[PDB]
C-alpha cells in the first residue's frame, strides 16, 4: 500500500460522471454501451462553413475533450467524419479527411496514451436522418470518435 498505487493515476470517476453530465448538458452526444464509448460532435460547432479551419473558440471544448479522454486506459481511437452533399463526391471526401486529420493531429500532440489513432472521413455516405434541410447546419455533418475501453 505505501509502495503500490491504490488507483490508476489521475482518476476521479465522480469528476468523470460530473464532466460526462456536463458534456451532455452542453449537447455533445456521449454514448456508453458495453465497453465501447462514442462521442459525437456537430460540425458547425467545430469548423467554419465547409472549411478545414478550427474556430478559435473551439479549443476550450477541445481541452475538455482531451481532459475526458485522458481518463481511461485505452488502445485505439477511431475518428470518423461525415458531411453533407455540396459539389461533388471527392470534394466532400477530401474535406472530411482534412477535418479528421486536423483533430487527430492535435489530439495525438496532446497526451492521450493510446497506441493507435485511426482516422477517416467519408463525406455524405452514411447519413443519420432523412432530414436534409441545411448544409453544415444539418446534424448529419458531424465528427464521431469511438473506442473500446480495455480492462
Amino acid at each position: 500500500v505505501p509502495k503500490l498505487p491504490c488507483r490508476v493515476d489521475g482518476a476521479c470517476d465522480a469528476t468523470i460522471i460530473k464532466m460526462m453530465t456536463d458534456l451532455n448538458k452542453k449537447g455533445i452526444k456521449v454514448a456508453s454501451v458495453g465497453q465501447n464509448y462514442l462521442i459525437s460532435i456537430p460540425a458547425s460547432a467545430l469548423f467554419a462553413d465547409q472549411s478545414p479551419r478550427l474556430n478559435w473558440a473551439s479549443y476550450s471544448l477541445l481541452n475538455e475533450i482531451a481532459a475526458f479522454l485522458k481518463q481511461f486506459r485505452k488502445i485505439a481511437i477511431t475518428v470518423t467524419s461525415y458531411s453533407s452533399k455540396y459539389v461533388s463526391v471527392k470534394r466532400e471526401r477530401a474535406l472530411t479527411l482534412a477535418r479528421s486529420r486536423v483533430v487527430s493531429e492535435y489530439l495525438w500532440s496532446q497526451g492521450v496514451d493510446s497506441r493507435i489513432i485511426f482516422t477517416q472521413g467519408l463525406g455524405s455516405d452514411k447519413p443519420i436522418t432523412s432530414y436534409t434541410l441545411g448544409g453544415d447546419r444539418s446534424p448529419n455533418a458531424r465528427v464521431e470518435i469511438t473506442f473500446r475501453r480495455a480492462v
Binding site: 478559435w56 481541452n63 496532446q110
Partner: protein, 137 residues
Amino acid sequence: KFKKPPINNPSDDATIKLAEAAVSVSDSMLEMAKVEKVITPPSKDNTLTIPNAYNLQARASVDWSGPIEELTARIAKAAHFRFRVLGKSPSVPVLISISTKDESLAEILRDIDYQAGKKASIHVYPNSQVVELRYAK
C-alpha cells in the same frame, strides 16, 4: 480561447539535439534495412494459387503435426478428389505442422505447399479432379 502547447515538448536545448539525433538515426537505419533487404518478384513466385473450384470452399478446424501423405489424402477425400503421387518418399518424412480453427481448404493446401519448401511440391487439376504430390530428387 486557449490553444494549449504540446505537453511533452522538447523545451530543452539539449533534448532538441537528442530528438534530432533520434530522427537521424531512425531514417539512417531505415535506409540500411531498405538497401539490405532481398525481395522476390510476384511475377514468378513459387506459391500455389487458388484453384477456385466449388469443391474447395468449405470451412474446417484442422490440427496435424506429422507426415504429409495421410493428411493430404484425407483433405483430398474431403474435397472428393482423387490423389496421386510422383517420386519416391524419403527415408525421413517431410514433416509439416498446421493447426487452425476456421478457414478454407484452398489456403490449407497453400500453406502446406509453403511449408513444403524444396522437398516437394503440390498440384491441382480441377477439370479431372486430381491432386498430385510431386517429390524432389
